[PDB]
Amino acid sequence: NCVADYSVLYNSASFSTFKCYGVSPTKLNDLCFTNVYADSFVIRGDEVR
Amino acid sequence: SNLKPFERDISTEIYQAGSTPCNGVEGFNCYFPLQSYGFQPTYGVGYQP
């Protein structure tokens, strides 16, 4: 129940890596979704793989 | 943008993905548009050439 702007997170140099293939990230904004799961947590640097 | 029928394209110009202008041979949101496949005798159907 909100409008999700992914451009700000998309075009900020304050991140290390941004990876996903389920949909091309440039067209995330124009695709409409039902629920968003934010899995936010911490891991080791090299364990992202 | 997608190319028209039988429109061969050979250019290997580094593609810009984000807002920042694409400078140098590499950069954030700058990518070499060509990728190599994987072909080995160990592979199975679907990934064989």
From Swiss-Prot, chain B:
Known consequence of changing E26Q? In strain: Kappa/B.1.617.1
Disulfide pairings: C22-C30
- In terms of domain of life, where is this protein from? Viruses
- Describe what happens upon changing A17V: Increased resistance to neutralizing antibodies
Q: Where is this region: Receptor-binding motif?
A: 1-49
In this chain, the stretch annotated as Disordered covers: 1-32
Q: Per UniProt, what does mutating F32S do?
A: In strain: Lambda/C.37, Omicron/BQ.1.1, Omicron/XBB.1.5, Omicron/EG.5.1
What does altering T20K do?
In strain: Delta/B.1.617.2, Omicron/BA.1, Omicron/BA.2, Omicron/BA.2.12.1, Omicron/BA.2.75, Omicron/BA.4, Omicron/BA.5, Omicron/BQ.1.1, Omicron/XBB.1.5, Omicron/EG.5.1
What does changing S19N do?
In strain: 20A.EU2, Iota/B.1.526, Omicron/BA.1, Omicron/BA.2, Omicron/BA.2.12.1, Omicron/BA.2.75, Omicron/BA.4, Omicron/BA.5, Omicron/BQ.1.1, Omicron/XBB.1.5, Omicron/EG.5.1
Q: What is the effect of changing F28V?
A: In strain: Omicron/BA.4, Omicron/BA.5, Omicron/BQ.1.1
What does this chain do?
Attaches the virion to the cell membrane by interacting with host receptor, initiating the infection. The major receptor is host ACE2. When S2/S2' has been cleaved, binding to the receptor triggers direct fusion at the cell membrane. When S2/S2' has not been cleaved, binding to the receptor results in internalization of the virus by endocytosis using host TFRC and GRM2 and leading to fusion of the virion membrane with the host endosomal membrane. Alternatively, may use NRP1/NRP2 and integrin as entry receptors.
Quaternary structure, per UniProt, is: Binds to host ACE2. RBD also interacts with the N-linked glycan on 'Asn-90' of ACE2. Cleavage of S generates a polybasic C-terminal sequence on S1 that binds to host Neuropilin-1 (NRP1) and Neuropilin-2 (NRP2) receptors. Interacts with host integrin alpha-5/beta-1 (ITGA5:ITGB1) and with ACE2 in complex with integrin alpha-5/beta-1 (ITGA5:ITGB1). May interact via cytoplasmic c-terminus with M protein. May interact (via N-terminus) with host bilirubin and biliverdin, thereby preventing antibody binding to the SARS-CoV-2 spike NTD via an allosteric mechanism.
Q: What is this protein called?
A: Spike protein S1
Recorded source organism is Severe acute respiratory syndrome coronavirus 2 (2019-nCoV)
